[PDB]
């Protein structure tokens, strides 16, 4: 093996995933479309506490960036604490559970804990054939870099790292801290990776997303996200195989590393753009998966891919583990 700890740093919104099995007489209370993912409003406050009661649940350390780092450590059977992760949580039992589920993943998590807000949480409300998801960010959105990421002891773990990845959802929380990490990857010429996460980031956080873009070694994104990203910046093309070209020719601050743009397409090829020219890799099929996680499998692609890049392997092999990873899920 001989891979080393804290070799891959990650950072993002730690969400505590709470799945179970409900019905509808539990959903109509809070009125929720059987298969839809939205954000929690002040009329959903209880829905959390009332999902740990009347329903048998599992507790997984969730959130995109955190999902990707745990899958990267899974494919990283050894050593342990090979991947690190910073985020904000609350000082309540939910955060207690999160701290636990992550160590129980050999992930080296180091959280910014606080009281103001509860630990965030995502709610898996499955009726078997649906996915009503309720997300409440809370604590994940209170991260303070000056009192956590800026501290010597944690910042030294960002130093032990030779690869950084942050899902773009985190730009909605702290671009200043996304930046300190990206910038640093430049100054010490290490790899810094990023996710477009959702089309809304490209449409509504472009200023923050363009500030880090020059400091972005690799870029992860999907079909649609790719699509909207081009729409704004003015690429004109609608051809993904082309967008990957126009984007990756974007002003890259560090010039010592030319960039790689991996645009996934759900389960259907993968478009990589490098300094040379654009190729395309077809996916591993697992046909007629009615259960197909689909949404949230791109997080798994990213972990598997990351697991192979922390060892500087052929991009073709990083993309191989991306499929091994997405999915066991
Ligand atoms: C679809 N929902 C459930 C959804 C999607 C994705 C996430 C998500 C995940 N998976 N992992 C980590 N962070 C976030 C996060 C986050 C997040 C979501 C939305 C948002 N805004 C949307 C409205 O405009 C203001 C910015 N800002 C931040 C959570 C919830």
> What is the CATH classification number for the domain harbouring 48?
3.30.1110.10
- DSSP state at residue 105: T
From 41, 63, 85, 169, give the residue whose CB has the most ligand 1 atoms within 8 Å, as the site to mutate: 169
Residues 177 and 325 in one domain: yes
Structure-determination approach: X-ray
Q: How far is CA 11 from the centre of its chain?
A: 9
Residues 78 and 222 in one domain: yes
Q: Could you tell me the residue range of the domain that residue 214 belongs to?
A: 1-13+63-119+137-329
Going by C-alpha positions, the residue among 165, 143, 123 that lies closest to residue 36 is: 123
Residues 164 and 224 in one domain: yes
| Specified resolution (Å) | 2.3
Q: DSSP secondary structure string, 32-46?
A: --TT-EEE--TTSHH
Residues 125 and 152 in one domain: no
CATH code, 265: 3.40.1190.20
Residues 48 and 141 in one domain: no
CB atoms within 10 A of CB 287: 6
Q: Could you give the CA distance from residue 268 to residue 17 in angstroms, rounded to a whole number?
A: 27
Q: Of 108, 136, 164, which closes a domain?
A: 136
Q: How far is CA 118 from the centre of its chain?
A: 21
Residues 147 and 199 in one domain: yes
Is residue 255 classed exposed, middle or buried when 0-12, 13-18 and 19+ CB atoms within 10 A define those classes? exposed
Going by C-alpha positions, the residue among 128, 127, 173 that lies closest to residue 149 is: 173
Q: Could you give the CA distance from residue 113 to residue 100 in angstroms, rounded to a whole number?
A: 14
Residues 43 and 170 in one domain: no
| Ligand 1 atom 24: residue of nearest CA | 200
Q: Could you give the CA distance from residue 182 to residue 197 in angstroms, rounded to a whole number?
A: 17
- Maximum separation of any 2 CA atoms in the chain, in Å: 58
Which residues, listed in sequence order, are joined to residue 113 by a DSSP beta bridge?
Answer: 89
CA of 207 to the centre of ligand 1 (A): 18
Which 3 state secondary structure label does DSSP give 273?
A: strand
Catalytic residue among 17, 108, 217, 299: 299
Residues 163 and 71 in one domain: yes
Residues 128 and 193 in one domain: no
Residues 6+ apart with CB under 8 A from 144: 88, 112
Quote the number of domains for the chain.
Answer: 2
Q: Of 101, 136, 171, which closes a domain?
A: 136
CB atoms within 10 A of CB 232: 14
Going by C-alpha positions, the residue among 280, 268, 267 that lies closest to residue 316 is: 280
Catalytic, 299? Answer: yes
Residues 152 and 38 in one domain: no
Beta strand pairing call for 191-195 and 270-273? unpaired
Q: Could you give the CA distance from residue 12 to residue 244 in angstroms, rounded to a whole number?
A: 25
Cis peptide before 220 (omega within 30 of 0): no
Q: Calculate ∠ Cα 41-88-21, nearest 5°.
A: 50
Q: How far is CA 236 from the centre of its chain?
A: 28
Ligand 1, CB within 6 Å, residue ranges: 12-13, 15, 37-39, 63-64, 133, 135, 137, 169, 172, 200
Residues 192 and 287 in one domain: yes
**CB-CB contact of 57 with 20 (8 Å):** yes
Residues 6+ apart with CB under 8 A from 255: none
Residues 114 and 50 in one domain: no
Helix-, strand-, coil-residue percentages of the chain, each rounded to 5? 35, 20, 40
Q: Of 136, 164, 179, which closes a domain?
A: 136
CA of 135 to the centre of ligand 1 (A): 7
Q: Give the dihedral sign, CA 110/108/105/190.
A: positive
First to last CA, the chain: 25
| Ligand 1 atom 17: residue of nearest CA | 169
- DSSP state at residue 24: S
């Amino acid at each position: 093996t001989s891979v080393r700890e804290n070799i891959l740093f990650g950072m993002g919104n730690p969400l505590l995933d709470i799945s179970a099995v409900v019905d509808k007489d539990f959903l109509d209370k809070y009125s929720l479309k059987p298969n839809d993912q939205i954000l929690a409003e002040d009329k959903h406050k209880e829905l959390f506490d009332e999902l740990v009661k009347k329903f048998k649940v599992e507790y997984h350390a969730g959130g995109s960036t955190q999902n990707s780092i745990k899958v990267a450590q899974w494919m990283i059977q050894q050593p342990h604490k090979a991947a690190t992760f910073f985020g904000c949580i609350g000082i309540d039992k939910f955060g207690e559970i999160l701290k636990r589920k992550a160590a129980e993943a050999h992930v080296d998590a180091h959280y910014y804990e606080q009281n103001e807000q509860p630990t965030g949480t995502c709610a898996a409300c499955i009726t078997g054939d649906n996915r009503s998801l309720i997300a409440n960010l809370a604590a994940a959105n209170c991260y303070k870099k000056e009192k956590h990421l800026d501290l010597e002891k944690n910042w030294m773990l960002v130093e032990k790292a030779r690869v950084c990845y942050i899902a773009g959802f985190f730009l909605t929380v702290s671009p200043e801290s996304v930046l300190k990490v990206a910038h640093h990857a430049s100054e010490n010429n290490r790899i810094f990776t990023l996710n477009l996460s959702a089309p809304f980031i490209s449409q509504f956080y472009k200023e923050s997303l363009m500030k880090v873009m020059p400091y972005v070694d690799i870029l992860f994104g999907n079909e649609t996200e790719a699509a909207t990203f081009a729409r704004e910046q003015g690429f004109e093309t609608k051809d993904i195989k082309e967008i990957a070209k126009k984007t990756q020719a974007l002003p890259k601050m560090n010039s010592k590393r030319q960039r790689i743009v991996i645009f996934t397409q759900g389960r259907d090829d993968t478009i990589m753009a490098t300094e040379s020219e654009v190729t395309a890799f077809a996916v591993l099929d697992q046909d007629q998966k009615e259960i197909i996680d689909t949404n949230g499998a791109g997080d798994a692609f990213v972990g598997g891919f990351l697991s192979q890049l922390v060892s500087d392997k052929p991009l073709t092999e990083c993309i191989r583990a991306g499929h091994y990873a997405a999915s066991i899920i």
